[PDB]
Structure formats: C-alpha cells, structure tokens
C-alpha cells in the first residue's frame, strides 16, 4: 500500500496549477465545469480526489460528506500520508489529499499544497486504503 499510495499522491500532485472549476473533473482528469465552471477546464475538491484515486483502482463516491461517512475514521494522531481530510460537519464543505508532514493537496483558486489548516477541520480522517485503530 505505500507503494500505491505512491501512484494516488503522484496523480494528485500533477495537477498542480489547475484552476479550480465548479463540479469540475473527475477520473478523466480535469474536465468542463458547470455554473461559473461552464467553461473553465479544471476540478472541485471531489473532483481532484476521485482522479488521484482512480490510481489505486478505486472509484469514490464524488460528494465530500458522502465520503466521510463510508470511509473508515482515523484520528489525526494516527495520520497517514494518502489520508483524506476533511472540512465541515461530517465532512459536507470540502475535501483534501493528506500529504504527510503537515501537507495537503487542496483546491483553492488552483490545484495547490498547503499546510494543513484545523479551522473547520472534520474531526476524523478517512484512511482509504486497506485490528485498525479504535475510533
């Protein structure tokens, strides 16, 4: 699994500089919006996700809070790198790619790293990939 999450963090960071779309992109990469995206050529945060995880072979549901409630919790103390984060009550705002070492792929105005931010962080983590950890 480090291995493929090696293959997700790659996918996901060759996107940097991608202009952020509304409903945008996907597993074909980034894609035509709609709304203000209509004609802009990029991703959401769900869209950035689900194309760097098509490289482990995985199709994830696109909305964030969907996301969250499937996926299998993870306390920040226990973080991993290819760990999602999320923003919002039960993860509903807004996604992002854990990079390790205080790092996530996001999209603001662009695909972009960021050090992680803890306002309005989800309180959980998802791990995707794979007793576990209690809750």
């Not at 963090?9 to 991608?18: C, D, E, N, P, T």
């Not at 996700?49 to 490289?55: C, L």
């Amino acid at each position: 699994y480090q291995q493929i999450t090696d293959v997700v963090i790659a996918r996901g960071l060759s996107q940097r500089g991608v202009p952020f779309s509304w409903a945008g992109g996907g597993i074909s990469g980034p894609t035509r919006g709609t709304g203000t995206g209509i004609n802009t050529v990029g991703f959401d945060a769900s869209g950035l996700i689900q194309y760097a995880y098509a490289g482990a072979g995985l199709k994830l549901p696109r909305s964030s809070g969907q996301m969250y409630k499937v996926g299998q919790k993870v306390l920040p103390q226990q973080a991993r790198k290819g760990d999602l984060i999320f923003y919002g009550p039960e993860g509903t705002q807004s996604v992002a790619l854990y990079l390790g070492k205080g790092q996530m792929l996001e999209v603001g105005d662009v695909v972009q790293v960021s050090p992680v931010r803890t306002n309005g962080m989800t309180p959980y983590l998802v791990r995707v990939l794979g007793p576990v950890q209690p809750a």
